[PDB]
């Protein structure tokens, strides 16, 4: 029939998509980020200490790390020569440090307690930010600079979402000047009880391959006390057209755009002429989902690739901090969208695997049992969320694995796999601890897991029986 | 239908879970009379064909004054699952459905 | 216990920092009037006796 | 008709449970864990870092023998029963044949340890008993079944002294003349301690094996033999429980013998009938070795007075381990026998009928499953049998596959040993084990259940 | 029942016993401990008394230089001209050899914008972009390119790329002092530049007690992005087979196996001439054809591997040179793989004869009629599996290291079912779409896919049992 045309077009589209995904997911750049991370994250803060960035504990540990492993990993010795981190990775410009803090007096205390305590600082919020000079007010490290003046944006850290403003300092190109600047910052105390977040940003090039790398390290100081570190190493490609494979990838991208336009036109024409319902098929909703995701990806790529003005601005003055955070954010978004799109395109292959009596009856069984599976899955998920909310309310303050609701869901999903530690859950509560685990495992593996099998087996049996009886009695 | 079957297969499920309780108690008795022989070498077959419930993948052995009720229930219930003893419930439920 | 209190607890109470204590600490002891003869060190005893 | 058997079995199970609790919290084995660290987990000397569990050279063995070893033997504090004994086994030069191609570069050649190629001639200064070969009978020895070979009870032995200085001087003399040459294959160091403060007896045997290639392989064995004594009424209560368990077996055996004078061979058709004999023989073996233990504890307890003779007591720890295993398995089997009795209702009746009807097909598919399991085990042995250390021997391969079924994979050594045909084996094994093969027992059980239920429903409606 | 099936059975058991003897004779114990002691001596030993770094945890070129002048020389030369015995049993054969593979400066195309500030670029390793020119004090074989043919080398297929057999090589000495002086002079002059891409160290030992050579090869890869990747290979071989009577027994067993294979070949060829032409409709015939092909390949490998032992004779003629024992080890590995595969297949061929009663016949029929539906559903299962693997590769392909490669993604997904993963690194790599992937995969893998397999098996078994019961009942 006409399925041959659709199969050929879909195969060509899949080949183009696979070529594009193989091109974007290049050769081993895993080792690039691996070496960078192990250089900066796994290195102990000092020759005598055993703590690294991943296991920071207090603010003094942060100060030891700043004038320490960071300076060792940033400047490599080989008029004011530049720094090659592995004798290949070139440090672009200078790194930048930034601080976000709240103001004293953003915090209300009971009137009967205003005798022994005077100072309390609220949690981070845009309304309670501090926008006043402090300490020896000389430069940009003691003066508030707006988000617009810093060309910054939000971050969405772990505790909260942080603004793009704060008190910032641009370091130097040599180690001695940066060490002097950090010592001056530390001597005139810069991280007091009012601070709430600290960012460190820089970038490298690694001219051997054509792949920039952007590094951002964040440290959060919650109001309750402690230190929470996080990191981000992101590789980008901003000088794409260099080799022949780049031109091949560009041609493939143009072909992909043509394919997407053809699919959009076909979808519009085939929904407009007739079939006004069009949505009781599940093979037309998947098509529009794929089209929407691909159009979003194309728009993101078009809007991102044209905003390379930061590279041009940096290349004409190489003594300033280059702003590459927006490009990294949009690259991450594009990667997520492309991954989801390719997953759905691969899923779309089920429409064409019907070529013998064996493969047709399996599809018929799945389509017939989908309704019952959904009906039972509603109840299964209701019971699952009841377990999750009970665990969150009971163990959510002592176990480090039930601290958030989604973490409770993931913890139960891991309990199903058996990847859990029973020792921690029982010591949080001697009673109701073993009861929770026991009843969860029992009612999950003995009851809920078997109803799915019952439904699937009954549907498959009835489908095969009726098909065989009507086929053999014709 | 679903809940109906769950309330129609209750006696058979209770009999199966009674059998499972007996089997789990037997295993827990067997699995702690030879891990108490911790020292440094338990056996060959008993070291490989043995199940400990999730957590402490490498056994610390020697349950000195720590063989509480909760770990016994944990290990018995998890050993009951690994061996596929709980899947027997399907054998009932399917028929009822 | 006394060195631990000397090096950890005391700097935590009077060592002015965030989240003030709001009340002095206290140590409470029970005597049991039945001084116990300890088992020689080595193998553990079953919890308490 | 069946109530008296139920009540007698309930009393028997209660007694067995009280004995099981009796031999569960004796704290006999934490003692040996505590003294394992004294000899095993201890640096050889002040400047070194390696212990007995991580020995890697002959010089490490010499440093340990005159170092950490001479600390536990001569002061928690213990008493040395008699004197410790150390002995070696060695092969003779020329026991193997050097190929003619390169015989001009290699002169000395030794072989893997074997009785056919074992040294029996004196060496070094033929003054003491460590330079003369004494036969197995003259040493009251036996085989050991070590890691790489089975070592006989003969060899070149030398019993140490009672004071630390004398033993140190004697081992220094053993150092002055080369006593561990290139011909040695294994070395045994065995002794026993007393530990007056808590009535525990410990037998210690440490073995160091020297392979034909190089290096050393250490092994240890600690066994706390215990002496029975009554002080309170609680342990006297345990003794009374022991005796009542003892003559429950007499009732069981006489009841077994009485009912066999009628049936000739019909006793073996029933599965529950062929379990009673297993229970009886297993329990009587356990009680026999237990009663033999006490007859050997005597004389042993008076050995610490002035004896300079080696306390040959390695024949008791083996039976102690066997007793532990027998007790565990008999507890499991009596609990299964309790599992027999639950047939009160009709639901339990149909479940029992289903199991009894599906047992045969379960056995057949077990045979097929074991065939496939052995095929994979042999493939794994031939592929990863020389790098991974989990497939070093065939039984290791079988046990590793069984552990993999229960979700205990490593996959790092498997990946490193073979980048291709390593992942293929793992993926195919997982797929064909967790999706096809193990899903065939449940099909048999389900079909048997369906047929039993249909038959019962059809037969009950008509009658 | 008849004489033909009995003859087939007895022939198959004779073949199985012959093959089991052959496989047992080549898989002796005490061979694992040889390689384990070798690895412990050479890998786990710290590079220096004042450092905790070993070969397995190399991190830079300075660490490599410390290792070469440190634990390598300590473990290679033992004292007691003169010869070196490793563990007083293992004799070091000839001299070790070091080799370097490097690329050339200017093998790139630096972008025009950044051309003013960067002047040097070295590409990743490739045959078309590798250096072939002298450098440094060009007065030896360490500073002169030697072609692959002149080195008697071959490819390696390392971790990052597949390296060539050529490069700049140096043959070390027999004593420790001369080798130390050579390495010191090779380090004082900068021999490892920014263009260096790979380094190899090769040697061998004998261990005359048993008859078993050992070949050791250590590789260090320097990626274009910086860093060091170490890898090792210890392989035992046997080149002097005919020594003891057991070797003669094994040779006789090999001849018997050759006769058995010839008999099977002639039977299969004679079968397909006119009688039952194009008989590939039976599973057992295809299995037999596969077994014959694998056995023929193994025999051909064995014939053309013991014949070319000329390298051993050349080394024994002059024992002051480098023994070349790499092709023999490679072909030994290939032969071992083929032997394992063929013994597995001949073992699973045993199902042709286990039909002695009704239970085994019923089980065999049930398994036979499950194959079509199981394959049909496995197609869909693997389609979904590959879709998930591609999604995980695109999402976590640069941070987790368990999804750094497509096959690594497949293996990690298979391990997830076993529940031996971390989930902390994959959750911190992507807070959204990371946990979604894990939860959705677990749900659709334990609740929808396993139950379908078991339902298919249950239905097929019930149908087969009913059909067989009706058959005999009607009879
Ligand atoms: C000694 C006297 C009695 C001893 C009694 C001790 C027995 C100890 C407990 C057994 C369990 C009870 C029967 C269960 C069998 C029926 C159910 C069943 O077999 O389940 C399937 C196979 O599972 C499995 O592993 C199957 C493992 C083997 C169990 C099947 C029965 C083998 C019996 C062969 C001979 C019996 C007749 C001879 C006895 C005299 C699927 O599982 P599942 O999807 O969840 O995979 C989860 C994965 O993590 C584990 O592989
Ligand atoms: C913080 O503000 C309080 C009033 O709310 C004031 O008493 C105190 O002096 C301030 N702390 C300083 C000046 O650091
Ligand atoms: C923000 O970008 C502008 C260019 O549009 C630049 O002139 C300015 O210096 C940047 N802000 C900072 C703080 O460097
Ligand atoms: C070992 O025996 C061989 C047999 O010829 C002899 O040549 C050699 O000298 C002996 N070596 C020793 C250690 O005496
Ligand atoms: C070997 O056993 C016999 C029999 O008890 C004993 O007389 C002898 O002392 C033992 N070995 C010795 C020391 O000869
Ligand atoms: C490397 O190549 C560049 C460009 O081809 C050239 O300018 C330079 O002299 C070469 N050598 C070095 C040591 O950079
Ligand atoms: C390669 O083999 C030939 C064969 O005679 C030999 O002459 C040559 O020396 C070998 N190559 C090296 C580098 O030794």
PDB file of N, CA, C and O in Angstrom, chain A residues 25 30 33 35 82 87-88 90 156-157 205-208 242 339 342 346 350 358-359 410 414 417 419 453 460 464, chain E residues 109 111 117-118 121-122 194 224-226 372-373 376 384 390-391 397-398 401 421 423 431 435 438 446 454 459 463:
ATOM      1  N   UNK A  25      26.932  14.827  19.834  1.00  0.00           N
ATOM      2  CA  UNK A  25      27.595  14.031  20.866  1.00  0.00           C
ATOM      3  C   UNK A  25      28.905  13.541  20.266  1.00  0.00           C
ATOM      4  O   UNK A  25      28.995  12.442  19.719  1.00  0.00           O
ATOM      5  N   UNK A  30      34.225  13.428  27.353  1.00  0.00           N
ATOM      6  CA  UNK A  30      34.068  13.035  28.746  1.00  0.00           C
ATOM      7  C   UNK A  30      35.369  13.207  29.514  1.00  0.00           C
ATOM      8  O   UNK A  30      35.364  13.637  30.673  1.00  0.00           O
ATOM      9  N   UNK A  33      36.085  17.079  30.671  1.00  0.00           N
ATOM     10  CA  UNK A  33      35.420  17.468  31.907  1.00  0.00           C
ATOM     11  C   UNK A  33      35.878  16.617  33.082  1.00  0.00           C
ATOM     12  O   UNK A  33      35.925  17.107  34.214  1.00  0.00           O
ATOM     13  N   UNK A  35      38.980  15.382  33.639  1.00  0.00           N
ATOM     14  CA  UNK A  35      40.238  15.936  34.123  1.00  0.00           C
ATOM     15  C   UNK A  35      40.016  17.268  34.819  1.00  0.00           C
ATOM     16  O   UNK A  35      40.589  17.518  35.885  1.00  0.00           O
ATOM     17  N   UNK A  82      50.672  33.720  29.836  1.00  0.00           N
ATOM     18  CA  UNK A  82      49.345  33.203  30.120  1.00  0.00           C
ATOM     19  C   UNK A  82      49.442  31.830  30.783  1.00  0.00           C
ATOM     20  O   UNK A  82      50.522  31.252  30.927  1.00  0.00           O
ATOM     21  N   UNK A  87      48.838  22.370  29.971  1.00  0.00           N
ATOM     22  CA  UNK A  87      49.678  22.717  28.829  1.00  0.00           C
ATOM     23  C   UNK A  87      48.908  22.655  27.517  1.00  0.00           C
ATOM     24  O   UNK A  87      49.503  22.832  26.448  1.00  0.00           O
ATOM     25  N   UNK A  88      47.602  22.411  27.572  1.00  0.00           N
ATOM     26  CA  UNK A  88      46.704  22.494  26.428  1.00  0.00           C
ATOM     27  C   UNK A  88      45.539  23.442  26.659  1.00  0.00           C
ATOM     28  O   UNK A  88      45.141  24.157  25.737  1.00  0.00           O
ATOM     29  N   UNK A  90      43.768  26.651  27.687  1.00  0.00           N
ATOM     30  CA  UNK A  90      44.123  28.055  27.852  1.00  0.00           C
ATOM     31  C   UNK A  90      43.065  28.763  28.685  1.00  0.00           C
ATOM     32  O   UNK A  90      41.874  28.690  28.371  1.00  0.00           O
ATOM     33  N   UNK A 156      19.028  29.365  40.099  1.00  0.00           N
ATOM     34  CA  UNK A 156      18.268  28.252  40.675  1.00  0.00           C
ATOM     35  C   UNK A 156      19.209  27.219  41.306  1.00  0.00           C
ATOM     36  O   UNK A 156      19.366  26.093  40.831  1.00  0.00           O
ATOM     37  N   UNK A 157      19.860  27.651  42.382  1.00  0.00           N
ATOM     38  CA  UNK A 157      20.717  26.759  43.141  1.00  0.00           C
ATOM     39  C   UNK A 157      19.946  25.693  43.893  1.00  0.00           C
ATOM     40  O   UNK A 157      18.833  25.330  43.499  1.00  0.00           O
ATOM     41  N   UNK A 205      39.764  27.113  26.874  1.00  0.00           N
ATOM     42  CA  UNK A 205      39.567  26.901  25.442  1.00  0.00           C
ATOM     43  C   UNK A 205      40.003  25.528  24.950  1.00  0.00           C
ATOM     44  O   UNK A 205      39.224  24.854  24.273  1.00  0.00           O
ATOM     45  N   UNK A 206      41.232  25.094  25.246  1.00  0.00           N
ATOM     46  CA  UNK A 206      41.743  23.795  24.793  1.00  0.00           C
ATOM     47  C   UNK A 206      41.742  23.705  23.264  1.00  0.00           C
ATOM     48  O   UNK A 206      40.958  22.986  22.650  1.00  0.00           O
ATOM     49  N   UNK A 207      42.649  24.480  22.665  1.00  0.00           N
ATOM     50  CA  UNK A 207      42.647  24.700  21.220  1.00  0.00           C
ATOM     51  C   UNK A 207      42.874  23.435  20.398  1.00  0.00           C
ATOM     52  O   UNK A 207      42.639  23.464  19.185  1.00  0.00           O
ATOM     53  N   UNK A 208      43.347  22.343  21.003  1.00  0.00           N
ATOM     54  CA  UNK A 208      43.589  21.120  20.236  1.00  0.00           C
ATOM     55  C   UNK A 208      42.319  20.661  19.528  1.00  0.00           C
ATOM     56  O   UNK A 208      42.254  20.630  18.295  1.00  0.00           O
ATOM     57  N   UNK A 242      34.789  24.861  11.031  1.00  0.00           N
ATOM     58  CA  UNK A 242      36.243  24.806  10.938  1.00  0.00           C
ATOM     59  C   UNK A 242      36.660  23.727   9.945  1.00  0.00           C
ATOM     60  O   UNK A 242      37.431  23.990   9.016  1.00  0.00           O
ATOM     61  N   UNK A 339      17.396  15.357  23.234  1.00  0.00           N
ATOM     62  CA  UNK A 339      17.315  14.002  23.769  1.00  0.00           C
ATOM     63  C   UNK A 339      15.870  13.520  23.820  1.00  0.00           C
ATOM     64  O   UNK A 339      15.563  12.390  23.414  1.00  0.00           O
ATOM     65  N   UNK A 342      14.629  12.839  20.186  1.00  0.00           N
ATOM     66  CA  UNK A 342      15.145  11.616  19.580  1.00  0.00           C
ATOM     67  C   UNK A 342      14.535  10.390  20.250  1.00  0.00           C
ATOM     68  O   UNK A 342      14.269   9.378  19.590  1.00  0.00           O
ATOM     69  N   UNK A 346      12.437   7.624  18.135  1.00  0.00           N
ATOM     70  CA  UNK A 346      12.696   6.189  18.209  1.00  0.00           C
ATOM     71  C   UNK A 346      11.447   5.423  18.631  1.00  0.00           C
ATOM     72  O   UNK A 346      11.182   4.329  18.122  1.00  0.00           O
ATOM     73  N   UNK A 350       7.250   1.963  16.402  1.00  0.00           N
ATOM     74  CA  UNK A 350       6.267   0.904  16.614  1.00  0.00           C
ATOM     75  C   UNK A 350       5.138   0.938  15.593  1.00  0.00           C
ATOM     76  O   UNK A 350       4.446  -0.071  15.422  1.00  0.00           O
ATOM     77  N   UNK A 358       2.464 -12.876  14.079  1.00  0.00           N
ATOM     78  CA  UNK A 358       2.997 -12.871  15.436  1.00  0.00           C
ATOM     79  C   UNK A 358       3.097 -11.456  15.993  1.00  0.00           C
ATOM     80  O   UNK A 358       2.727 -11.210  17.147  1.00  0.00           O
ATOM     81  N   UNK A 359       3.589 -10.511  15.189  1.00  0.00           N
ATOM     82  CA  UNK A 359       3.795  -9.150  15.669  1.00  0.00           C
ATOM     83  C   UNK A 359       2.503  -8.347  15.744  1.00  0.00           C
ATOM     84  O   UNK A 359       2.451  -7.352  16.473  1.00  0.00           O
ATOM     85  N   UNK A 410      11.679   8.871  44.804  1.00  0.00           N
ATOM     86  CA  UNK A 410      12.856   8.194  44.264  1.00  0.00           C
ATOM     87  C   UNK A 410      13.369   7.135  45.232  1.00  0.00           C
ATOM     88  O   UNK A 410      13.834   6.071  44.808  1.00  0.00           O
ATOM     89  N   UNK A 414      13.805   3.196  44.457  1.00  0.00           N
ATOM     90  CA  UNK A 414      15.042   2.458  44.698  1.00  0.00           C
ATOM     91  C   UNK A 414      14.819   1.284  45.641  1.00  0.00           C
ATOM     92  O   UNK A 414      15.484   0.251  45.509  1.00  0.00           O
ATOM     93  N   UNK A 417      13.966  -1.684  43.738  1.00  0.00           N
ATOM     94  CA  UNK A 417      15.150  -2.342  43.195  1.00  0.00           C
ATOM     95  C   UNK A 417      15.982  -3.028  44.268  1.00  0.00           C
ATOM     96  O   UNK A 417      16.845  -3.845  43.934  1.00  0.00           O
ATOM     97  N   UNK A 419      17.940  -1.225  46.293  1.00  0.00           N
ATOM     98  CA  UNK A 419      19.090  -0.353  46.510  1.00  0.00           C
ATOM     99  C   UNK A 419      18.717   0.644  47.608  1.00  0.00           C
ATOM    100  O   UNK A 419      18.300   1.778  47.363  1.00  0.00           O
ATOM    101  N   UNK A 453       0.209  -8.422  36.266  1.00  0.00           N
ATOM    102  CA  UNK A 453       0.376  -9.684  35.560  1.00  0.00           C
ATOM    103  C   UNK A 453      -0.965 -10.331  35.261  1.00  0.00           C
ATOM    104  O   UNK A 453      -1.173 -10.859  34.165  1.00  0.00           O
ATOM    105  N   UNK A 460      -3.990 -10.949  27.069  1.00  0.00           N
ATOM    106  CA  UNK A 460      -3.266 -11.690  26.042  1.00  0.00           C
ATOM    107  C   UNK A 460      -3.959 -13.007  25.724  1.00  0.00           C
ATOM    108  O   UNK A 460      -4.083 -13.387  24.554  1.00  0.00           O
ATOM    109  N   UNK A 464      -5.461 -13.825  22.006  1.00  0.00           N
ATOM    110  CA  UNK A 464      -4.955 -14.947  21.226  1.00  0.00           C
ATOM    111  C   UNK A 464      -6.046 -15.979  20.979  1.00  0.00           C
ATOM    112  O   UNK A 464      -6.170 -16.504  19.867  1.00  0.00           O
TER     113      UNK A 464
ATOM    114  N   UNK E 109      43.890  23.114  12.404  1.00  0.00           N
ATOM    115  CA  UNK E 109      43.505  24.339  11.706  1.00  0.00           C
ATOM    116  C   UNK E 109      42.932  25.278  12.770  1.00  0.00           C
ATOM    117  O   UNK E 109      41.733  25.255  13.057  1.00  0.00           O
ATOM    118  N   UNK E 111      41.383  28.418  14.526  1.00  0.00           N
ATOM    119  CA  UNK E 111      40.488  29.453  14.000  1.00  0.00           C
ATOM    120  C   UNK E 111      41.210  30.780  13.820  1.00  0.00           C
ATOM    121  O   UNK E 111      42.127  31.123  14.570  1.00  0.00           O
ATOM    122  N   UNK E 117      46.914  34.339  19.038  1.00  0.00           N
ATOM    123  CA  UNK E 117      47.310  34.099  20.417  1.00  0.00           C
ATOM    124  C   UNK E 117      47.731  32.662  20.697  1.00  0.00           C
ATOM    125  O   UNK E 117      48.491  32.435  21.644  1.00  0.00           O
ATOM    126  N   UNK E 118      47.297  31.698  19.889  1.00  0.00           N
ATOM    127  CA  UNK E 118      47.728  30.309  20.005  1.00  0.00           C
ATOM    128  C   UNK E 118      48.477  29.931  18.736  1.00  0.00           C
ATOM    129  O   UNK E 118      47.991  30.177  17.627  1.00  0.00           O
ATOM    130  N   UNK E 121      49.132  23.510  17.818  1.00  0.00           N
ATOM    131  CA  UNK E 121      47.999  22.601  17.936  1.00  0.00           C
ATOM    132  C   UNK E 121      48.429  21.203  17.524  1.00  0.00           C
ATOM    133  O   UNK E 121      49.058  21.028  16.478  1.00  0.00           O
ATOM    134  N   UNK E 122      48.086  20.219  18.348  1.00  0.00           N
ATOM    135  CA  UNK E 122      48.333  18.814  18.056  1.00  0.00           C
ATOM    136  C   UNK E 122      47.003  18.080  18.031  1.00  0.00           C
ATOM    137  O   UNK E 122      46.240  18.139  19.001  1.00  0.00           O
ATOM    138  N   UNK E 194      54.693  17.687  24.129  1.00  0.00           N
ATOM    139  CA  UNK E 194      53.246  17.833  24.053  1.00  0.00           C
ATOM    140  C   UNK E 194      52.641  17.006  22.928  1.00  0.00           C
ATOM    141  O   UNK E 194      51.430  16.763  22.937  1.00  0.00           O
ATOM    142  N   UNK E 224      44.498  14.300  23.988  1.00  0.00           N
ATOM    143  CA  UNK E 224      44.772  15.649  23.508  1.00  0.00           C
ATOM    144  C   UNK E 224      44.284  16.720  24.473  1.00  0.00           C
ATOM    145  O   UNK E 224      44.728  17.869  24.379  1.00  0.00           O
ATOM    146  N   UNK E 225      43.389  16.373  25.393  1.00  0.00           N
ATOM    147  CA  UNK E 225      42.862  17.313  26.371  1.00  0.00           C
ATOM    148  C   UNK E 225      43.646  17.313  27.676  1.00  0.00           C
ATOM    149  O   UNK E 225      43.263  18.025  28.610  1.00  0.00           O
ATOM    150  N   UNK E 226      44.718  16.542  27.765  1.00  0.00           N
ATOM    151  CA  UNK E 226      45.503  16.475  28.986  1.00  0.00           C
ATOM    152  C   UNK E 226      45.086  15.324  29.879  1.00  0.00           C
ATOM    153  O   UNK E 226      43.933  14.894  29.898  1.00  0.00           O
ATOM    154  N   UNK E 372       8.852 -18.316  18.894  1.00  0.00           N
ATOM    155  CA  UNK E 372       8.363 -17.315  17.950  1.00  0.00           C
ATOM    156  C   UNK E 372       7.819 -16.086  18.672  1.00  0.00           C
ATOM    157  O   UNK E 372       8.210 -14.951  18.370  1.00  0.00           O
ATOM    158  N   UNK E 373       6.921 -16.296  19.637  1.00  0.00           N
ATOM    159  CA  UNK E 373       6.351 -15.175  20.378  1.00  0.00           C
ATOM    160  C   UNK E 373       7.413 -14.464  21.206  1.00  0.00           C
ATOM    161  O   UNK E 373       7.401 -13.231  21.317  1.00  0.00           O
ATOM    162  N   UNK E 376       9.375 -12.299  18.854  1.00  0.00           N
ATOM    163  CA  UNK E 376       8.564 -11.165  18.449  1.00  0.00           C
ATOM    164  C   UNK E 376       8.483 -10.093  19.519  1.00  0.00           C
ATOM    165  O   UNK E 376       8.570  -8.900  19.222  1.00  0.00           O
ATOM    166  N   UNK E 384      12.664  -0.603  22.712  1.00  0.00           N
ATOM    167  CA  UNK E 384      12.500   0.301  23.850  1.00  0.00           C
ATOM    168  C   UNK E 384      13.811   0.442  24.617  1.00  0.00           C
ATOM    169  O   UNK E 384      14.172   1.538  25.069  1.00  0.00           O
ATOM    170  N   UNK E 390      19.808   5.376  24.195  1.00  0.00           N
ATOM    171  CA  UNK E 390      20.174   6.587  23.468  1.00  0.00           C
ATOM    172  C   UNK E 390      19.826   7.838  24.264  1.00  0.00           C
ATOM    173  O   UNK E 390      20.609   8.798  24.296  1.00  0.00           O
ATOM    174  N   UNK E 391      18.660   7.850  24.913  1.00  0.00           N
ATOM    175  CA  UNK E 391      18.295   8.996  25.742  1.00  0.00           C
ATOM    176  C   UNK E 391      19.301   9.197  26.872  1.00  0.00           C
ATOM    177  O   UNK E 391      19.751  10.321  27.133  1.00  0.00           O
ATOM    178  N   UNK E 397      25.962  11.598  29.023  1.00  0.00           N
ATOM    179  CA  UNK E 397      27.119  11.079  28.317  1.00  0.00           C
ATOM    180  C   UNK E 397      28.441  11.750  28.617  1.00  0.00           C
ATOM    181  O   UNK E 397      29.460  11.327  28.063  1.00  0.00           O
ATOM    182  N   UNK E 398      28.469  12.779  29.464  1.00  0.00           N
ATOM    183  CA  UNK E 398      29.704  13.502  29.727  1.00  0.00           C
ATOM    184  C   UNK E 398      30.035  13.672  31.204  1.00  0.00           C
ATOM    185  O   UNK E 398      31.078  14.256  31.516  1.00  0.00           O
ATOM    186  N   UNK E 401      30.027   8.789  33.785  1.00  0.00           N
ATOM    187  CA  UNK E 401      31.032   7.801  33.369  1.00  0.00           C
ATOM    188  C   UNK E 401      30.474   6.390  33.250  1.00  0.00           C
ATOM    189  O   UNK E 401      31.182   5.501  32.763  1.00  0.00           O
ATOM    190  N   UNK E 421      23.357   0.214  41.307  1.00  0.00           N
ATOM    191  CA  UNK E 421      23.764   1.518  40.795  1.00  0.00           C
ATOM    192  C   UNK E 421      23.821   2.518  41.941  1.00  0.00           C
ATOM    193  O   UNK E 421      23.521   2.180  43.090  1.00  0.00           O
ATOM    194  N   UNK E 423      22.764   6.314  41.653  1.00  0.00           N
ATOM    195  CA  UNK E 423      21.614   7.212  41.559  1.00  0.00           C
ATOM    196  C   UNK E 423      21.895   8.562  42.212  1.00  0.00           C
ATOM    197  O   UNK E 423      21.111   9.502  42.059  1.00  0.00           O
ATOM    198  N   UNK E 431      19.042  17.404  37.659  1.00  0.00           N
ATOM    199  CA  UNK E 431      17.993  17.362  38.672  1.00  0.00           C
ATOM    200  C   UNK E 431      16.626  17.099  38.058  1.00  0.00           C
ATOM    201  O   UNK E 431      15.769  16.480  38.699  1.00  0.00           O
ATOM    202  N   UNK E 435      16.104  12.054  37.261  1.00  0.00           N
ATOM    203  CA  UNK E 435      15.192  11.176  38.011  1.00  0.00           C
ATOM    204  C   UNK E 435      13.996  10.708  37.201  1.00  0.00           C
ATOM    205  O   UNK E 435      13.494   9.602  37.441  1.00  0.00           O
ATOM    206  N   UNK E 438      15.034   7.594  35.337  1.00  0.00           N
ATOM    207  CA  UNK E 438      15.185   6.440  36.217  1.00  0.00           C
ATOM    208  C   UNK E 438      13.831   5.882  36.638  1.00  0.00           C
ATOM    209  O   UNK E 438      13.585   4.674  36.536  1.00  0.00           O
ATOM    210  N   UNK E 446       9.790  -3.135  35.232  1.00  0.00           N
ATOM    211  CA  UNK E 446       9.355  -4.175  36.156  1.00  0.00           C
ATOM    212  C   UNK E 446       7.859  -4.451  36.115  1.00  0.00           C
ATOM    213  O   UNK E 446       7.437  -5.536  36.530  1.00  0.00           O
ATOM    214  N   UNK E 454       6.211 -13.307  31.114  1.00  0.00           N
ATOM    215  CA  UNK E 454       5.669 -14.411  31.897  1.00  0.00           C
ATOM    216  C   UNK E 454       4.273 -14.798  31.425  1.00  0.00           C
ATOM    217  O   UNK E 454       3.918 -15.981  31.440  1.00  0.00           O
ATOM    218  N   UNK E 459       0.766 -18.779  28.905  1.00  0.00           N
ATOM    219  CA  UNK E 459      -0.240 -19.144  27.914  1.00  0.00           C
ATOM    220  C   UNK E 459       0.265 -20.246  26.994  1.00  0.00           C
ATOM    221  O   UNK E 459      -0.468 -21.198  26.693  1.00  0.00           O
ATOM    222  N   UNK E 463      -1.402 -23.997  26.685  1.00  0.00           N
ATOM    223  CA  UNK E 463      -1.882 -24.500  25.403  1.00  0.00           C
ATOM    224  C   UNK E 463      -1.184 -25.798  25.021  1.00  0.00           C
ATOM    225  O   UNK E 463      -1.829 -26.743  24.551  1.00  0.00           O
TER     226      UNK E 463
END
